[PDB]
């Protein structure tokens, strides 16, 4: 029918999980009419677009929504001229009248909402333009800015907008939602799974849902009618097996440059992701009791530097080889 992420997107504010602070504030705003300008920020896949769509629906209903909502995202031009003309014109617009059905069934507060999703992709000029548009029309229009990186939002807009931080969805936060989705889609999982899914998917319920869907598709294609094991989950999540990681650690322990170079060549031929293996190396080294404090300090800084360099779209082979060579000389 549909991918489980878009199939199980929350429809009302009750379905949004583990973000209680923002959701209670918004639910209380439902019965009031003084909704502020909101700045939704948090890690990817934490429930921000879901929250804003659920609130907008609960506010206006399917009918008034089309006339009282303007959504701008990164897929459309949002330059200084667009911010100065289209957003200002929509804010200037008078509030369209509700119908009888809208007035009785939905709350229909006396204002319109401008949702600026992916606001971290806007230049500082456009945000400076938005400052006074947000301010001088605060009684007729409300602004919602959604982003992952707050630092990309200029200080004036961050001051005007009320800040709603969305927590990362760990195992404890999203285990109930994952169980709900698994049970309703008839997913047979071994105990321990649905927690490994959320541990691999660090602060990301979209990734966890897609992982569950892929595991379900595999277990259904097998036709064997057995549960999903954690090993399968780690296999199709891109996690390096513990034996390969152990070989990496043992070749690092014997600090011979040529052996490490050859092993890294074969491993990068195996197609793994450098970020994932760097993360696994972090877990192995920092949690190991066989190393002293000095080694752990140096390894923590080395892993931080490697992660920062990998985040810049560099060469995975060179970065991984340099990291492992540095570890071998620690």
Partner 1 sequence: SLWVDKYRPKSLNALSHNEELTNFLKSLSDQPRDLPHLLLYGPNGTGKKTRCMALLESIFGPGVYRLKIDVRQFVTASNRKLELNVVSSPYHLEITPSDMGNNDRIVIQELLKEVAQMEQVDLAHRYKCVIINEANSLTKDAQAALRRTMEKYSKNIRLIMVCDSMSPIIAPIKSRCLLIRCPAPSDSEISTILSDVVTNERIQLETKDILKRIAQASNGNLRVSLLMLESMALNNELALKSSSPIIKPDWIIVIHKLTRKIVKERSVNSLIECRAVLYDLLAHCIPANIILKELTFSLLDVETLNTTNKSSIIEYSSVFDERLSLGNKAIFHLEGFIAKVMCCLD
Partner 2 sequence: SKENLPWVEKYRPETLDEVYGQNEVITTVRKFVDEGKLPHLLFYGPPGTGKTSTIVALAREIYGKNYSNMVLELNASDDRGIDVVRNQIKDFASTRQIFSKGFKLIILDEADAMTNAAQNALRRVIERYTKNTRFCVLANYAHKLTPALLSRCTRFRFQPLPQEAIERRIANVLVHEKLKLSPNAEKALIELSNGDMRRVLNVLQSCKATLDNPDEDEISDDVIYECCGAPRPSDLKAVLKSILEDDWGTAHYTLNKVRSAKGLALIDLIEGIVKILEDYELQNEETRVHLLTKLADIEYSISKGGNDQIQGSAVIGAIKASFENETV
Ligand X SMILES: Nc1ncnc2c1ncn2[C@@H]1O[C@H](COP(=O)(O)OP(=O)(O)OP(O)(O)=S)[C@@H](O)[C@H]1O
Angle between helices 293-310 and 316-328 (to 10 degrees): 170
Structure tokens at 96: 């369209």
Between 161 and 200, how does the x/- string for binding to partner 2 read (CB under 8 A)?
xxx-x-xx-x-xx---------------------------
| Nearer CB in complex with partner 1: 221/290 | 221
φ, ψ of residue 75 to 5 degrees: the values are: -80, -5
DSSP 159-175: HHSEEEEPPP--HHHHH
> Binding residue per annotation — 47?
yes
User: Which is nearer to partner 2, 55 or 187 (by Cβ)?
Assistant: 55
Q: Which of residues 107-146 bind Mg ion (CB under 5 A)?
A: none
Residue 130 binds which of ligand X, partner 2, partner 1, none (CB < 5-8 A, kind-dependent): partner 2
Least distance in Å: CB of 1 to partner 1? Answer: 6
- Compute the radius of gyration of the chain from its Cα atoms: 24
Read off the DSSP letter of residue 115: E
Judged by CB under 8 A, the number of residues near partner 1 is 60
Shortest distance (Å) from residue 59 CB to partner 1:
19
Residue 206 in contact with partner 1, rule: CB under 8 A: yes
Long-range pairs, 312-320, Cβ under 8 A, ≥24: 316/268, 316/273, 316/274, 317/264, 317/265, 317/268, 317/274, 319/274, 320/264, 320/267, 320/268, 320/274, 320/277, 320/278
Q: Work out the number of other CB atoms within 10 angstroms of the CB of residue 266.
A: 8
Binding of partner 2 at residue 25 (CB under 8 A)?
yes
Binding part of the chain for partner 2, among 51-59, 232-240, 263-271, 276-284 by CB under 8 A, reads: 276-284
Residues that bind Mg ion (CB under 5 A): 49
Q: Which residues bind ligand X (CB under 6 A)?
A: 5, 8-10, 15-19, 44-50, 148, 156, 159, 169, 177, 205-206, 209
């Amino acid at each position: 029918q549909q991918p489980w992420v878009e199939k199980y997107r929350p429809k009302n504010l009750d379905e949004v999980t583990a973000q209680d602070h923002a959701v209670t504030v918004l639910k209380k705003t439902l019965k009031s009419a003084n909704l502020p300008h909101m700045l939704f920020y948090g890690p990817p896949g934490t429930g921000k677009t879901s929250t804003i769509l659920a609130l907008t629906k609960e506010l206006y209903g399917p009918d008034l929504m089309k006339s009282r909502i303007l959504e701008l995202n990164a897929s459309d031009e949002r330059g200084i001229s667009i911010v100065r003309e289209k957003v200002k014109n929509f804010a200037r617009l008078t509030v369209s009248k509700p119908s009888k059905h809208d007035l009785e069934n939905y709350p229909c507060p006396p204002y319109k909402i401008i949702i600026l999703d992916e606001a971290d992709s806007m230049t500082a000029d456009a945000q400076s333009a938005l400052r006074r548009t947000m301010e001088t029309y605060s009684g007729v229009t409300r602004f919602c800015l959604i982003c992952n990186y707050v630092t990309r939002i200029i200080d004036p807009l961050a001051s005007r907008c009320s800040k709603f931080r969305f927590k990362a969805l760990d195992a404890s936060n999203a285990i109930d939602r994952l169980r709900f989705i698994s049970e309703q889609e008839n997913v047979k999982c071994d105990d321990g799974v649905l927690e490994r899914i959320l541990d691999i998917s660090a602060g990301d319920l979209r990734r966890g849902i897609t992982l569950l869907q892929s595991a379900s598709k595999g277990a259904q294609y097998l036709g064997d009618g057995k549960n999903i094991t954690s090993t399968q989950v780690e296999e199709l999540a891109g996690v390096v097996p513990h034996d390969i990681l152990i070989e990496i650690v043992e070749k690092v322990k014997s600090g011979d440059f040529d052996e490490i170079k050859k092993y890294v060549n074969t491993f990068m031929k195996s197609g793994w992701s450098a970020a994932s293996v760097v993360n696994q190396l972090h877990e192995y080294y920092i949690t190991n009791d066989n190393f002293d404090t000095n080694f752990k300090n140096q390894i923590s800084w080395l892993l931080f530097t490697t992660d920062s360099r990998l985040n810049n779209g560099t060469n995975e082979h060179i970065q991984l080889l340099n990291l492992l060579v540095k570890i071998s000389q620690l």
